[PDB]
């Protein structure tokens, strides 16, 4: 009875809307106690397109992405096309495994075609230039988190551990 959406963080505003409901579910499997963004999900073999942000799956384990879980539905112009799988809360990869195990993990992932019309020359990156941090803290990390603005008094260290906790693989095409 818990469905979440897998959302990634490129330097592109292309997941500006992902869900019809501002919160979605009724529990959080992710925590922020000012010490760290606990229970963040990484998946292997999934590189991401920037414009119309879509994880195009290249099956190279050296290509990954670090994205957070949020509940909701993929605008209902989707959910017949994105990935719809269930996990037993023992196989999901999670950094800073301090959070909650809901025992019910349904997940919707942006999932597209490999489209063998070019090659998947991938490119990783690390985020910086806090303006890039902020133009997504505005649209995601405060859009789903009413927890924000409540403990947000040491409002920097919650944003500093954003830098070294996320890295993806772009295609630059």
């Amino acid at each position: 009875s818990t469905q979440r959406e897998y959302v990634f963080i490129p330097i592109t505003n292309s997941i500006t809307i992902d869900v019809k409901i501002t919160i979605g579910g009724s529990d959080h499997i992710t925590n922020i106690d000012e010490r760290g963004i606990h229970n963040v999900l990484v998946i292997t073999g999934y590189a991401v397109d920037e414009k119309n942000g879509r994880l195009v799956p290249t099956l190279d384990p050296c290509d990954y992405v670090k994205g957070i879980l949020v509940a909701g539905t993929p605008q209902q112009a989707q959910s017949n096309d994105f990935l719809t799988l269930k996990l037993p809360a023992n196989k999901l990869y999670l950094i800073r495994k301090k959070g909650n195990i809901s025992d019910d993990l349904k997940i919707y992932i942006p999932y597209s075609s490999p489209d063998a019309r070019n090659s998947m020359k991938t490119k990783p990156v690390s985020i910086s230039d806090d303006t890039i941090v902020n133009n997504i803290i505005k649209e995601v990390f405060d859009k789903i988190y009413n927890i924000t603005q409540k403990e947000k008094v040491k409002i920097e260290k919650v944003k500093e551990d954003i830098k070294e906790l996320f890295s993806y693989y772009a295609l630059e095409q």
Binding site: V42, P61, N90, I95
Partner: protein, 312 residues
């Protein structure tokens, strides 16, 4: 289930021989190990729970009469489990997310592989953000002249902790969860001090994969060597094999035995797990069972925190 060994101050885990004035015309020195050998933690926990008329010549038969199956050791900074990773003489503390794609990184071709290992041991390495060797030169003063003696000077490179750091070991037993929690141990050498913290922490063990990480030195039966050192590239992907001494026992005042081992942070392939079982006799099994008990033959999946002994 889990035990955190929190050092109160820099620690010294020597690794080599003499550390005392023996040659009249030279100083002595020593250097600390970044991760204490599981013999150290075994001996510490044994010192906490001791009975004074048991063993007297075994040092691990009676020790195994006290401890559960100790599982390997690694760092935890702020809930950030750091894990040792060893190349030839290179040792680095890498976080978890850099071990998943690792088996593929050493199977990449030349330049990609070397660039990967380089950025791992050099740039994605986090050892030097948490720990830096802090040298401490000492002297002995003879009261007759109030001056240093005839080169009674020693340099001991300690282990400075640039931030709040613990060592993580898991222990099967639960009756001990109360008899060591909140104990101020004499952890490590040079008369240093650490503090113990215990809390139940479910950890998954029975898992099998293709590549493993030596969280603790993998001992070798001292007869399979010629069967092992010949085809080393077929058992360990990266890492370091070496001859180590198991330590120094207190009840007998003797240096413990010497065994060729595969040091921490080394990456062993699955073909070794059976190999040792194939290359160990029936009573050397009875001995290496205790060895694994005190925490030696510990492994871990590169995909998830899933520990695994070898002979068990």
């Amino acid at each position: 289930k889990r035990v955190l060994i929190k050092p109160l101050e820099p620690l010294m885990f020597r690794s080599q021989g003499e550390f005392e004035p023996l040659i009249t015309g030279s100083h002595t020195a020593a250097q600390s190990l970044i991760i204490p050998r599981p013999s150290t933690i075994a001996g510490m926990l044994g010192y906490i729970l001791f009975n004074k008329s048991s063993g007297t010549g075994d040092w691990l038969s009676d020790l195994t009469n006290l401890l559960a199956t100790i599982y390997g050791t690694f760092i935890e900074t702020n809930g950030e489990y750091l894990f040792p990773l060893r190349m030839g003489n290179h040792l680095a503390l890498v976080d978890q997310q850099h071990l998943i794609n690792l088996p593929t990184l050493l199977e990449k071709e030349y330049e990609r592989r070397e660039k990967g290992i380089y950025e791992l041991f050099y740039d994605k390495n986090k050892l030097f953000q948490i720990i830096n060797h802090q040298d401490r030169i000492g002297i002995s003063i003879d009261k007759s002249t109030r001056t240093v003696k005839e080169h009674y000077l020693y340099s001991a490179r300690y282990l400075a902790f640039k931030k709040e750091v613990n060592y993580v070991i898991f222990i099967d037993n639960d009756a001990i969860s109360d008899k060591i929690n909140g104990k101020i141990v004499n952890f490590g050498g040079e008369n240093r001090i650490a503090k113990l913290e215990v809390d139940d922490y479910k950890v998954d063990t029975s898992i099998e994969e293709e590549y493993y990480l030596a969280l603790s030195p993998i001992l070798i039966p001292d007869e399979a060597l010629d069967n092992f050192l010949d085809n080393i590239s077929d058992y360990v992907a990266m890492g370091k094999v070496d001859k180590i001494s198991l330590g120094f026992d207190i009840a007998n005042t003797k240096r413990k035995e010497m065994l060729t081992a595969i040091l921490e942070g080394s990456i062993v392939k699955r073909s070794i797990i059976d190999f040792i079982k194939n290359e160990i006799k029936n009573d050397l099994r009875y001995r290496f069972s205790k060895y694994e008990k005190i925490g030696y033959n510990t492994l871990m999946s590169l995909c998830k925190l899933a520990l695994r002994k070898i002979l068990s």
